[PDB]
């Protein structure tokens, strides 16, 4: 056996292990390298494919097992030769051109279809003439105009893209990007045509002429079709024909943009851009002439052709530049048009340097100087054009302004002072710059004032200049203060306030120049975000409906698209409203709010689109969506920054704006009532009665929640968040007014619409009073009467809200039952009736029949909930009448009660029934407005359960019937209501998992078997009480079983593939209802006079338990919510419930042992604040944004649901028969037929449990999906095996129509989507069997894409080691995914799974995370080798986005640790930026690796910033940290763009200057990040600085020692180590003083701790210098004598470093904690090293 020590790769691991591969004459065999034991055998006759490589040997036998043997050795050839000999012993377009041709044909059909539709006419909806209908027309016209502008942008960007992409040879052209461009054009043409038809219909309405707009759109469509014709690969026309078609497309698009009014750039810019492009072209013509002369002179034929080719390429590139300028000139504001211009310009430049080099190949001084001059002109004009439309990029739209440069400088420098808070040096530097600039502005103002003839204008100018000068003086004194005290936080705060005062007094000297600039930048960013969202929606709707088979998460993309589509019009309305009223604060605040609300749906859509991209079969549509998602991510990041800056500028004006919105709405309702008296009021499009009613209900709930939140913010005395609360009130009232107008327009009888409109006007009146009172109270904090009056006005608003909701016609029947319940309760319960009629047992029978009727009525109401609204109203009325009958019988039985406490208990239980029935009718009232709501229906079923529970309790307590007979009745009244849970189980009724439900089914079956045996045995024996409790336990087990089986069916439905789950909501309602009802009943018990002390104790226990449950619910809600203001209000609600229940418990403790009536009255007074706190918390939690999202269960999901429901219903009906026969046997102990019937009922019951459990066990959700995913991954691994076997044999054929960076981006997107899924799949494998199948299918869908892209990329790669690296790392990721799949199919979501499955799951998760890391690293470094910086910008923008789009839960960490880590990361970022600056000059091919390192470092910093933001002491400090990190990300993405640009074009002079300026901005932003980190702790930061300084000192000492050991000149005159000793000793004394002051100042003022740290570092530096001087005094003749002393000082330095670390960890720590003790230990060690220094100094 010949053994080769080979290395084989572990599965799931990018790791090699030594293996011994042995070849016998008859077999090949694998042997361990340590144990030398055989691991596996393969017959030699078996193997059929062997392939050798210089670095590998690969063997494939195949038929024995799937998978081949690849083992990595350097002798792969010798081992292969053995194998080969022994086996002898044993025995015309291209395809990418065709793909683009098909894409162009489909797009041409789409273009023709769009043309044909423009002849058709849009029918406009029936529209009224009232203000809302006019506003609908105008908003729809604006939406159409915006969308047409965005789609024309996309068409011209795609046309320029086609021109740029087709510029090359028929080979090395990426036809997939050409197809993406043409699909972009055609998709946006379809969308544009639809929008133009709508806009033109709207134009023909109001009396305009839509026909010119139709003709312009038709001309654009015709030019587009001519372009698509010219772009066909089969075409043989000259390039100038495509260039002409593209320029015509640009012209026609400009004409169309003229017709709608969305031509944005002024025609002066258009003419300048044309003349600049033609200047470039003429300069290039001169260059071509010079190169022609050079080619004439040159002799060699080969070189002459190179000169000619260079000149022709220059001519071609400039012709395409003028063509692309024609294309993108109408739409040059678009970033993608600008990107296509810079691509054209770089092609022009590259051709220019090509011409220069081909000239340089010839030798003559005059001619080469001619060529260099001409080439230099060509690049000068190219820069002129490029910078001109870079100026175009910035909005800069409007008048120049009299003071423009000064105010722009002031804006910049004041923002710089704001961003460097916590850094005195940069703050005062920027403050000095600002003082100079503002003094220039003041001088300009005074000069203008002297110039002005008018006395008033000169007076106002001089007064403004004087106020501005006062502000500069104050800011200068603030700068002096911050310069005197570099570590004082107060000085830096006062400098910030002075800079803010300057920014505020510039807004008065100028015409709000800074605030206007910030609002204009917000408008620009918002328009870009809306356009990107529009283009992404077009791309998504194209890829979704494309004839490609869908293999991915497209439905979630559809939901995200519709959400963003309902968001876009509001953003567009905010932008247009801010431009319409430039000087209106309300317009600016509305734009800020619109953009901030746009942020979250847009992020969801970007994520959904990125998750959809890998699964789209068509590569063109997947690329269009990938490009559009990236653009929208960038737009969203820029919108976040712009809205932040605008909000900081625009100030706290939201409280007055809310009132303005409210009276605007009230005036609008007056206009609507006028139009209702007229005929103008008509339904607005899409407004149905059901939709408007649901809108009215949701709006009422939202207003109540916002009022609760407003009162909370007023209580906290936080004026900022009270403004947001009043804004939410105003928005909810806007929605309510809209829904009220819709309902009034839809109804026809004038009285009803009049009632609706007066109810809405009353709500708005009450809310105006509320907001006025809120303003008055937030103006003056700490006024108790103010809070009381606020509560009064808030409850008045809530009453008006309820009157508005109930005024609907369909509410009155449920309201009739509510009034019947309330009035019957008030009359019959608050007073007993001493008169009584009939015998006691007659009253018992009457009450029993009334209770039976009441329970059956509740069941009928629950069934009606699934029926028509008329059915629900009729059922509610019948239930109310049956409640009246029941309460009459109950008060009769209470009257005939013999004992006083007996009738007292009857009254209490009747009060409980009244409350439960009121809440049942309130659940019905909730349904009546939103009948199709699943959650409200489940709420009604739960309320029926509560009602029957109250009835059962009263009958059990107060009947004294024959033993065992109450138990059967209560059991059947339980069964009747619990049977309704099985009807439509499309909502969760517990929080159980699948296996929780299966366990509970088994446990309840066990308990019910015990109870069934009990009832049979004690019916035979005749022992009644045991029979009764056995019946009770049987019914209880049946109710629990029904709950478990109902959620079992629900989860089997949700688990289905096409099904979709729903968000659980912040507070679970059924648990919340039980808590509130219990607290209310207990407070009633405390309230009543006749309560014994035992009842008081029990009720105190009840309130304590339930209020604790509420506070825990509030904590979970705070952790779960993404809204910061909702999180604040949930914390406040928890705190106030805690305080109220604590005061209640205190007054209860006072009550215990006293019993006096006065203390009872005090307890009654104390129980009320708890009730009102619970009421405010219910009102706040009622916000529909906190509500649970319904699950969408597919029809096959309900098919899966049905068996469980059928079995459970059969069980429950048979159990009802069982209770009947058991009751009959309880009457008489034995009967021949009844016992047989009992046996039949029991057998049907048990058989039903067994078959239901069989179905549950066999279903096992997640196991079929896991098996499908395992088969899919095995197929992918076989594909990767075939690829690798082809690549070893040099048989891997490359892909010809697609680039490397495209296939690598495909791989990266698939890998990123797999990575996003690794963790949730494991979380489902632990707990949820319902989410597990979803996760595994979602994750298995990304591996066929990844395998295809990986095989293509490996085929493209030429270096065989690197292609094998890609193939092997993709194998590793696939194998680790299979390990997850096997382990998660074993775990299954079952919590009872053994520890071996848990450890295997954790290990597989870690393995596959490492495989993702490895493949991501490979792809990133492959992109960095080339100049490809896409993905780096995408990564940076993703980091910027994720830094905000995350819920806040305050996970634990110390801000000191985060500060140290992020300070290190930021300093690394800075040194990388400076490396990039130097390498730009030195080696420009190292900018891509450095850009990758910057991208990794920024990603680390940004991921660290969210924990440090939650962990920081202030929300303000964390806000600044995150905002600085996001600004730094903006800078970093710009810098990596310029870095890739310079790497690809290293000789370009202007890209290099742009890179240098980008690096300058990035370094300043790094400084701002560091200042944000320092602002968290001035003293802890000083410890990090001290650590770095002492580390540098230690390094210097090491340098001096390694000098002194071998070679050093220690001679300074006659100075020796005699006079040095006294100085060294005094310095060491200063050091011991310094370590003492560090120990004291560890816990104290941060300025004191910082000063101590700085003084210690200064002392150590002085000691190091003086010790070096002493060592040099010793002389070089004795090295050891010097080295011992320098090692002594080095030990002192190390001890100080450890002491600084101890102080940092001990800063802000109490005495008892270990941190302070560890400080004194290292402090003592510090002294011992100092004394060791002191004695050594004396000794020598």
1065-1187 fold: 1.20.120
The span from the CA of 877 to the CA of 857, in Å, is: 10
- Architecture of domain 405-509 in CATH? Up-down Bundle (1.20)
Asked if residue 763 lies in contact with residue 801, where contact means CB atoms within 8 angstroms, the answer is yes
Burial 1673-1706 (b: 16+ CB within 10 A, else e): bbbeeebeebbebbebbbbbbbbbbbbbbbbbbb
Residue 582: both structure tokens together: 């430039």
The span from the CA of 1464 to the CA of 971, in Å, is: 69
Q: What share of the chain is helix, strand, coil (3-state, %, to 5)?
A: 80, 0, 20
Q: Which residues is 29 bridged to in the sheet? A: 22, 41
Alpha carbons within 13 A on the beta-carbon side of 859: 18
CA nearest neighbour of 1058 among 609, 561, 553: 553
265-393 fold: 1.20.120
**Sequence-distant (≥ 6) Cβ neighbours of residue 1216 within 8 angstroms:** 972, 975
The span from the CA of 682 to the CA of 1224, in Å, is: 64
The distance of Cα 1169 from the centroid of its chain, to the nearest Å, equals 38
Q: Cβ of 595: how many Cβ atoms within 10 Å?
A: 28
β 49-52/57-60 pair status? antiparallel
Alpha carbons within 13 A on the beta-carbon side of 400: 3
CATH number assigned to the domain with residue range 516-650, chosen from the 4 options 2.40.50.140, 3.40.50.720, 3.40.1440.10, 1.20.120.230: 1.20.120.230
Asked if residue 728 lies in contact with residue 706, where contact means CB atoms within 8 angstroms, the answer is yes
The span from the CA of 1318 to the CA of 1373, in Å, is: 11
- What's 126's DSSP letter? P
Burial 85-116 (b: 16+ CB within 10 A, else e): ebeeeeeeeeebbebbbebbebbbebbeebbe
The span from the CA of 1307 to the CA of 1297, in Å, is: 17
Q: Which residues is 1060 bridged to in the sheet? A: 1192
The span from the CA of 807 to the CA of 820, in Å, is: 18
Residue 1058 region by backbone torsions, left for phi larger than 0, else alpha for psi between -120 and 50, else beta: alpha
The span from the CA of 359 to the CA of 1086, in Å, is: 102
The span from the CA of 958 to the CA of 786, in Å, is: 48
Helix (H) or strand (E) holding 49: strand 49-52
The span from the CA of 89 to the CA of 87, in Å, is: 5
- H-state helical runs in 1577-1616: 1578-1605
- H-state helical runs in 651-688: 654-677
- What's 1503's DSSP letter? H
Residue 1453: both structure tokens together: 């960490």
Asked if residue 605 lies in contact with residue 556, where contact means CB atoms within 8 angstroms, the answer is no
β 69-72/49-52 pair status? unpaired
**Sequence-distant (≥ 6) Cβ neighbours of residue 859 within 8 angstroms:** 944, 976, 977, 980
The span from the CA of 189 to the CA of 698, in Å, is: 38
CATH number assigned to the domain with residue range 100-263, chosen from the 4 options 1.20.1250.20, 1.20.1420.10, 3.40.190.10, 1.10.10.10: 1.20.1420.10
Asked if residue 190 lies in contact with residue 228, where contact means CB atoms within 8 angstroms, the answer is no
- C-alpha Rg value of the chain to the nearest Å: 40
Q: Any idea how long the chain is?
A: 1740
**Sequence-distant (≥ 6) Cβ neighbours of residue 1720 within 8 angstroms:** 1639
Instruction: Determine the Cα angle at 862 with ends 861 and 868, to 5°.
Output: 75
Rounded alpha-carbon distances, angstroms, from residue 917 to 779, 846, 1077, 1083, 1479? 44, 20, 12, 18, 79
CA nearest neighbour of 1610 among 1659, 1667, 1664: 1667
The span from the CA of 1128 to the CA of 1448, in Å, is: 11
967-1063+1192-1257 fold: A middle domain of Talin 1 (1.20.1420)
Task: Find the helix packing angle between 1069-1087 and 900-929, rounded to 10°.
Answer: 150
**Sequence-distant (≥ 6) Cβ neighbours of residue 1343 within 8 angstroms:** 1272, 1273, 1276, 1310, 1314, 1374, 1377
Phi, psi of 1094 (to 5 degrees): -65, -40
Which residue shows structure tokens 């400039």?
318
The span from the CA of 1369 to the CA of 440, in Å, is: 62
Asked if residue 769 lies in contact with residue 793, where contact means CB atoms within 8 angstroms, the answer is yes
Handedness of CA 1192, 1198, 1199, 1200 (dihedral sign): positive
Helix (H) or strand (E) holding 1462: helix 1455-1482
Q: What superfamily would CATH give domain 1260-1425?
A: Talin, central domain (1.20.1420.10)
Instruction: Determine the Cα angle at 1550 with ends 1549 and 1555, to 5°.
Output: 105
Q: Which residues is 23 bridged to in the sheet? A: 2, 28
Q: Cβ of 1297: how many Cβ atoms within 10 Å?
A: 22
DSSP class per residue in 1239-1269: HHHHHHHHHHHHHHHHHHHHH-TTHHHHHHH
Sheet holding 27-31, edge to edge: 38-43, 27-31, 16-23, 2-9, 69-72, 57-60, 49-52
The distance of Cα 442 from the centroid of its chain, to the nearest Å, equals 46
Handedness of CA 628, 634, 640, 642 (dihedral sign): negative
Burial 12-32 (b: 16+ CB within 10 A, else e): bebeeeebbbebeeebbbbbe
Instruction: Determine the Cα angle at 10 with ends 5 and 11, to 5°.
Output: 145
Rounded alpha-carbon distances, angstroms, from residue 851 to 863, 895, 1035? 19, 17, 18
Give CA torsion, residues 1650, 1651, 1656, 1657, to 10 deg. Answer: 70
CA nearest neighbour of 224 among 114, 88, 89, 311: 114
**Sequence-distant (≥ 6) Cβ neighbours of residue 1573 within 8 angstroms:** 422, 1459, 1462, 1463, 1466, 1508, 1521, 1581
Domain boundaries, the chain: 2-90, 100-263, 265-393, 405-509, 516-650, 654-806, 967-1063+1192-1257, 1065-1187, 1260-1425, 1427-1576, 1579-1739
β 16-23/69-72 pair status? unpaired
Residue 417: both structure tokens together: 């002072």
Rounded alpha-carbon distances, angstroms, from residue 1560 to 386, 391, 1531, 1737? 21, 20, 9, 48
CATH of domain 1579-1739: 1.20.1420.10
**Sequence-distant (≥ 6) Cβ neighbours of residue 1270 within 8 angstroms:** 1378, 1381, 1382, 1385
The span from the CA of 1573 to the CA of 1463, in Å, is: 7
Alpha carbons within 13 A on the beta-carbon side of 456: 0
**Sequence-distant (≥ 6) Cβ neighbours of residue 903 within 8 angstroms:** 832, 894, 895, 897
Q: What superfamily would CATH give domain 654-806?
A: Talin, central domain (1.20.1420.10)
Instruction: Determine the Cα angle at 66 with ends 56 and 1335, to 5°.
Output: 105
The span from the CA of 728 to the CA of 726, in Å, is: 5
The span from the CA of 1361 to the CA of 56, in Å, is: 10
Alpha carbons within 13 A on the beta-carbon side of 1111: 17
Instruction: Determine the Cα angle at 607 with ends 606 and 609, to 5°.
Output: 65
Task: Find the helix packing angle between 1578-1605 and 1679-1706, rounded to 10°.
Answer: 170
Which residue shows structure tokens 């026609």?
252
**Sequence-distant (≥ 6) Cβ neighbours of residue 1388 within 8 angstroms:** 1260, 1262, 1263, 1325, 1329, 1332
CA nearest neighbour of 1445 among 552, 524, 598, 526: 598
3-state secondary structure of 1035: helix
DSSP class per residue in 939-974: HHHHHHHHHHHHHHHHHHHS---STTHHHHHHHHHH
Asked if residue 1673 lies in contact with residue 1616, where contact means CB atoms within 8 angstroms, the answer is yes
Asked if residue 341 lies in contact with residue 324, where contact means CB atoms within 8 angstroms, the answer is yes
β 69-72/2-9 pair status? antiparallel
Which residue shows structure tokens 């004291």?
1640
DSSP class per residue in 1654-1709: HHHHHHHHHHHHHHHHHHHHH-TT-HHHHHHHHHHHHHHHHHHHHHHHHHHHHTT-
Q: Cβ of 302: how many Cβ atoms within 10 Å?
A: 8
3-state secondary structure of 1183: coil
The span from the CA of 1677 to the CA of 1665, in Å, is: 21
Q: Which residues is 72 bridged to in the sheet? A: 7
The span from the CA of 1483 to the CA of 1476, in Å, is: 9
The span from the CA of 1466 to the CA of 1563, in Å, is: 10
DSSP class per residue in 880-924: HHHHHHHHHHHHHHHHT-SSHHHHHHHHHHHHHHHHHHHHHHHHH
Asked if residue 6 lies in contact with residue 78, where contact means CB atoms within 8 angstroms, the answer is no
Q: What is the maximum span of the chain, computed from C-alpha positions, in angstroms?
A: 134
Asked if residue 1649 lies in contact with residue 1707, where contact means CB atoms within 8 angstroms, the answer is yes
CATH top-level class of 2-90: mainly beta
Way it was determined: cryo-EM
Helix (H) or strand (E) holding 3: strand 2-9
The span from the CA of 474 to the CA of 466, in Å, is: 12
- H-state helical runs in 1341-1431: 1343-1356, 1360-1387, 1395-1425
The span from the CA of 151 to the CA of 166, in Å, is: 22
Burial 861-875 (b: 16+ CB within 10 A, else e): bbebbeeebebbbbb
Q: Which residues is 50 bridged to in the sheet? A: 59
Which residue shows structure tokens 């004409």?
255
- What's 1610's DSSP letter? -
Confirm whether 2-90 and 1579-1739 share one CATH topology.
no
The span from the CA of 533 to the CA of 531, in Å, is: 5
Instruction: Determine the Cα angle at 1175 with ends 1174 and 1179, to 5°.
Output: 115
Residue 613: both structure tokens together: 């991209």
Asked if residue 91 lies in contact with residue 31, where contact means CB atoms within 8 angstroms, the answer is no
3-state secondary structure of 1192: strand
If you count DSSP H runs as helices and E runs as strands, how many of each does the chain have, helices first?
A: 53, 7
Residue 1707: both structure tokens together: 């800063």
1427-1576 fold: A middle domain of Talin 1 (1.20.1420)
Residue 749, classified by CB atoms within 10 Å of its CB into exposed (0-12), middle (13-18) or buried (19+), is exposed
Residue 174: both structure tokens together: 């990426």
CA nearest neighbour of 917 among 872, 873, 949: 949
Asked if residue 1386 lies in contact with residue 1403, where contact means CB atoms within 8 angstroms, the answer is no
Q: Cβ of 1094: how many Cβ atoms within 10 Å?
A: 8
**Sequence-distant (≥ 6) Cβ neighbours of residue 1076 within 8 angstroms:** 1174, 1178
- What's 2's DSSP letter? E
CA nearest neighbour of 1219 among 951, 957, 979, 1011: 1011
Asked if residue 21 lies in contact with residue 4, where contact means CB atoms within 8 angstroms, the answer is yes
Residue 530: both structure tokens together: 């809306």
The span from the CA of 704 to the CA of 797, in Å, is: 8
Q: Which residues is 128 bridged to in the sheet? A: none
CA nearest neighbour of 1339 among 1408, 1406, 1410, 1414: 1408
The span from the CA of 560 to the CA of 1512, in Å, is: 34
The span from the CA of 412 to the CA of 417, in Å, is: 9
The span from the CA of 1245 to the CA of 1222, in Å, is: 14
Residue 1009: both structure tokens together: 């078997």
Residue 1142: both structure tokens together: 């604590």
**Sequence-distant (≥ 6) Cβ neighbours of residue 1433 within 8 angstroms:** 634, 1533, 1536, 1537
- What's 614's DSSP letter? G
Residue 817: both structure tokens together: 């039952």
Give CA torsion, residues 1381, 1382, 1387, 1388, to 10 deg. Answer: 60
């Amino acid at each position: 056996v010949s053994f080769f020590l080979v290395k084989e790769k572990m599965k799931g691991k990018n790791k090699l292990v030594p293996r011994l591969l042995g070849i016998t004459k008859e077999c090949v065999m694998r042997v361990d390298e340590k144990t030398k034991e055989v691991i596996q055998e393969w017959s030699l006759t078996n193997i059929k494919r062997w392939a050798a490589s210089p670095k590998s040997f690969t063997l494939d036998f195949g038929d024995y097992q799937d998978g081949y043997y690849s083992v990595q050795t350097t002798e792969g050839e010798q081992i292969a030769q053995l194998i080969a000999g022994y086996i002898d012993i044993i025995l015309p377009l291209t395809s990418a051109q065709q793909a683009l041709t098909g894409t162009i044909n489909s797009s041409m059909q789409a273009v023709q279809a769009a043309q044909a539709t423009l002849d058709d006419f849009e029918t406009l909806p029936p529209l009224g003439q009232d203000a809302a209908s006019k506003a609908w027309r105008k908003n729809k016209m604006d939406e159409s105009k915006h969308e047409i502008h965005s789609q024309v942008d996309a068409i011209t960007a795609g046309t320029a893209s086609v021109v740029n992409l087709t510029a090359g040879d028929p080979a090395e052209t990426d036809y997939t990007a050409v197809g993406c461009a043409v699909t972009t054009i055609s998709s946006n043409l379809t969308e544009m045509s639809r929008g133009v038809k709508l806009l033109a219909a709207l134009l023909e309405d109001e009396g305009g002429n839509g026909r010119p707009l139709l003709q312009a759109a038709k001309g654009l469509a015709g030019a587009v079709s001519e372009l698509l014709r010219s772009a066909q690969p089969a075409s043989a026309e000259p390039r100038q024909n495509l260039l002409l078609a593209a320029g015509n497309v640009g012209q026609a698009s400009g004409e169309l943009l003229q017709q709608i009014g969305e031509s944005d750039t002024d025609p002066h810019f258009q003419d300048v851009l044309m003349q600049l492009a033609n200047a470039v072209a003429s300069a290039a013509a001169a260059l071509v002439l010079k190169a022609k002369s050079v080619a004439q002179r040159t002799e060699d034929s080969g070189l002459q052709t190179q000169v000619i080719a260079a000149a022709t390429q220059c001519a071609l590139s400039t012709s395409q530049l003028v063509a692309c300028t024609k294309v993108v000139a109408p739409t040059i504001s678009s970033p993608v048009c600008q990107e296509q211009l810079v691509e054209a310009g770089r092609l022009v430049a590259k051709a220019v340097e090509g011409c220069v080099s081909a000239s340089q190949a010839a030798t003559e001084d005059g001619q080469l100087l001619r060529g260099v001059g001409a080439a230099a002109t060509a690049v000068t004009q190219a820069l002129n054009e490029l910078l001109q439309h870079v100026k175009a990029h910035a909005t800069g739209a409007g008048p120049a302004g009299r003071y423009d440069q000064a105010t722009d400088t002031i804006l910049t420098v004041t923002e710089n002072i704001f961003s460097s808070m916590g850094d005195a040096g940069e703050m005062v530097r920027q403050a000095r710059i600002l003082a100079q600039a503002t003094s220039d502005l003041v001088n300009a103002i005074k000069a203008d004032a002297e110039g002005e003839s008018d006395l008033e204008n000169s007076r106002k100018l001089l007064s403004a200049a004087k106020i501005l000068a006062d502000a500069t003086a104050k800011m200068v004194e603030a700068a002096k203060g911050a310069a005197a005290h570099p570590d004082s936080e107060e000085q830096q705060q006062r400098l910030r306030e002075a800079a803010e005062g300057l920014r505020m007094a510039t807004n008065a000297a100028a015409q709000n120049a800074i605030k206007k600039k910030l609002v204009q930048r917000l408008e620009h960013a918002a328009k870009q975000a809306a356009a990107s969202a529009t283009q992404t929606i077009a791309a998504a709707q194209h890829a979704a409906s494309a004839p490609k088979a869908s293999a991915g998460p497209q439905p979630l993309l559809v939901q995200s698209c519709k959400a963003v589509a309902e968001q876009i019009p509001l953003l567009v309305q905010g932008v247009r409203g801010s431009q319409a009223q430039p000087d209106s604060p309300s317009a600016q605040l509305a734009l800020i709010a619109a953009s901030q609300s746009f942020l979250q749906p847009g992020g969801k859509m970007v994520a959904a689109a990125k998750a959809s991209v890998p699964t789209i079969q068509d590569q063109a549509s997947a690329m269009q969506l990938s490009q559009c998602a990236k653009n929208l991510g960038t737009a969203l990041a820029e919108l976040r920054t712009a809205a932040q800056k605008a909000q900081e500028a625009c100030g706290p004006l939201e409280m007055d704006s809310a009132l303005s919105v409210v009276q605007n709405l009230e005036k609008d309702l007056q206009e609507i009532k006028a139009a209702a008296r007229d005929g103008k009021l008509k339904p607005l499009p899409g407004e149905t009665m059901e939709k408007c009613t649901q809108d009215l209900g949701n709006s009422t709930k939202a207003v109540s929640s916002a009022i609760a939140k407003l009162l909370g913010e007023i209580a906290q005395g936080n004026e900022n968040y009270a403004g947001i609360a009043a804004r939410d009130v105003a928005g909810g009232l806007r929605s309510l007014a809209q829904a009220a107008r819709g309902v009034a327009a839809l109804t026809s009888d004038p009285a009803v619409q009049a009632i609706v409109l007066d109810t809405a006007s009353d709500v708005l009146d009450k809310a105006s009073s509320l907001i006025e009172e809120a303003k008055k109270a937030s103006g003056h904090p700490g006024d108790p009467e103010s809070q009381q009056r606020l509560a009064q006005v808030a409850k008045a608003v809530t009453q008006a809200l309820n009157r508005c909701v109930s005024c609907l016609p369909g509410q009155r029947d449920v309201d009739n039952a509510l009034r019947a319940v309330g009035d019957a309760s008030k009359r019959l319960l608050s007073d007993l009736l001493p008169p009584s009629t009939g015998t006691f047992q007659e009253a018992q029978s009457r009450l029993n029949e009334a209770a039976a009727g009441l329970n059956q009525a509740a069941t009928e109401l629950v069934q009606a909930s699934r029926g028509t609204p008329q059915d629900l109203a009729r059922a509610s009325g019948r239930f109310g009448q049956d409640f009246s009958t029941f309460l009459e019988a109950g008060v009769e039985m209470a009257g005939q009660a013999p004992s006083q406490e007996d009738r007292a208990q009857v009254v209490s239980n009747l009060k409980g029934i009244s409350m439960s029935s009121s809440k049942l009718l309130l659940a019905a009232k909730a349904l009546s407005t939103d009948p199709a709501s699943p959650n409200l229906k489940s709420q009604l079923a739960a309320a029926a359960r509560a009602v029957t529970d109250s009835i059962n309790q009263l009958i059990t307590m107060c009947t004294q019937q024959a033993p065992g007979q109450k138990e059967c009745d209560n059991a059947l009244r339980q069964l009747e209501t619990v049977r309704e849970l099985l009807e439509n189980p499309v909502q969760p009724i517990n929080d159980m998992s699948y296996f929780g439900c299966l366990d509970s089914v088994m446990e309840n079956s066990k308990v019910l078997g015990e109870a069934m045996t009990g009832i049979s045995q004690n019916a035979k024996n005749g022992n009644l009480p045991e029979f009764g409790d056995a019946i009770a336990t049987a019914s209880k087990a049946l109710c629990g079983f029904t709950e478990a089986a109902a959620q079992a069916a629900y989860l089997v439905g949700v688990s289905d593939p096409n099904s979709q789950a729903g968000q659980q909501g912040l507070v679970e309602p059924t648990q919340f209802a039980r808590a509130n009802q219990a607290i209310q009943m207990a407070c009633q018990s405390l309230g009543e006079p006749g309560c014994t002390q035992a009842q008081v104790l029990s009720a105190a226990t009840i309130v304590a338990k339930h209020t604790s449950a509420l506070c825990n619910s509030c904590r979970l809600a705070s952790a779960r919510t993404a809204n910061p203001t909702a999180k604040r209000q949930f914390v406040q609600s928890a705190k106030e419930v805690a305080n109220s229940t604590a005061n209640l418990v205190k007054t209860i403790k006072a009550l215990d042992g006293d019993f006096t009536e006065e203390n009872r009255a005090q307890c009654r007074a104390a129980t009320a604040p708890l009730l009102e706190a619970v009421d405010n918390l219910s009102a706040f939690a009622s916000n529909p944004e906190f509500s649970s999202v319904p699950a969408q269960i597919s029809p096959e999901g309900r098919a899966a649901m049905e068996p469980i429901v059928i079995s459970a219903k059969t069980m429950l009906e048979s159990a009802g028969g069982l209770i009947q026969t058991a009751r009959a046997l309880a009457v008489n102990p034995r009967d021949p037929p009844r016992w047989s019937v009992l046996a039949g009922h029991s057998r049907t019951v048990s058989d039903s449990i067994k078959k239901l459990i069989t179905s549950m066990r066999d279903k096992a959700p997640g196991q079929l999906e896991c098996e499908t995913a395992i088969a899919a991954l095995n197929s992918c691994l076989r594909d990767l095996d075939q690829a690798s076997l082809a690549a070893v044999s040099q048989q891997l054929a490359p892909r010809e129509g697609i680039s490397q960076e495209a296939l690598h981006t495909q791989m990266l997107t698939a890998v990123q989507e797999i990575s996003h899924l690794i963790e949730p799949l494991a979380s489902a494998a632990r707990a949820e069997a319902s989410q597990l199948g979803h996760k595994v299918s979602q994750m298995a869908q990304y591996f066929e894409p990844l395998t295809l892209a990986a095989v293509g990329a490996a085929s493209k790669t030429l270096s065989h080691p690197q292609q094998m690296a890609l193939l092997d790392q993709t194998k590793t990721l696939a194998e680790s995914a299979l390990q997850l799949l096997y382990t998660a199919k074993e775990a299954g979501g079952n919590p009872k799974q053994a520890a071996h499955t848990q450890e295997a799951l954790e290990e597989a998760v870690q393995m596959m995370t490492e495989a993702v890391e490895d493949l991501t690293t490979t792809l990133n470094e492959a992109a960095s080798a080339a100049g490809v910086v896409g993905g780096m910008v995408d990564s940076i923008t993703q980091a910027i986005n994720q830094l905000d789009e995350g819920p806040m839960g305050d996970p634990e960490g110390s801000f000191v640790d985060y500060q140290t880590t992020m300070v290190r990361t930021a300093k690394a970022i800075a040194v990388t930026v400076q490396e990039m600056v130097t390498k730009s000059n030195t080696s420009p091919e190292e900018l891509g690796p450095l850009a990758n390192q910057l991208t990794s470092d920024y990603g680390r910093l940004a991921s660290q910033a969210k924990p440090a933001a939650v962990a920081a002491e202030n929300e303000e400090i964390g806000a600044h940290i995150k905002h600085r990190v996001q600004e730094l990300g903006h800078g970093c993405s710009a810098l990596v763009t310029k870095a890739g640009a310079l790497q690809c074009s290293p000789s370009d002079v202007y890209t290099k200057k742009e890179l240098i300026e980008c690096a300058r901005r990035v370094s300043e932003k790094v400084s701002h990040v560091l200042a944000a980190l320092q602002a968290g702790n001035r003293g802890t930061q000083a410890c990090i600085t001290a650590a770095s300084a002492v580390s540098g000192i230690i390094a210097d000492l090491d340098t001096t020692i390694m000098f002194a050991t071998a070679g050093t000149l220690n001679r300074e005159g006659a100075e020796t180590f005699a006079d040095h000793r006294e100085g060294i000793l005094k310095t060491a004394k200063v050091l011991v003083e310094d370590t003492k002051v560090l120990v004291q100042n560890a816990a104290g003022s941060q300025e004191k701790l910082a000063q101590a740290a700085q003084s210690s570092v200064a002392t150590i530096t002085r000691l190091a210098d003086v010790v070096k001087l002493g060592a040099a005094s010793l002389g070089a003749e004795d090295p050891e004598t010097q080295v011992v002393l320098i090692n002594a000082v080095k030990d002192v330095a190390k001890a100080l470093g450890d002491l600084i670390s101890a102080t940092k960890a001990a800063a802000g720590k109490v005495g008892d904690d270990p941190a302070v003790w560890q400080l004194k230990n290292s402090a003592k060690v510090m002294v011992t090293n100092v004394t060791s220094l002191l004695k050594t100094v004396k000794a020598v």
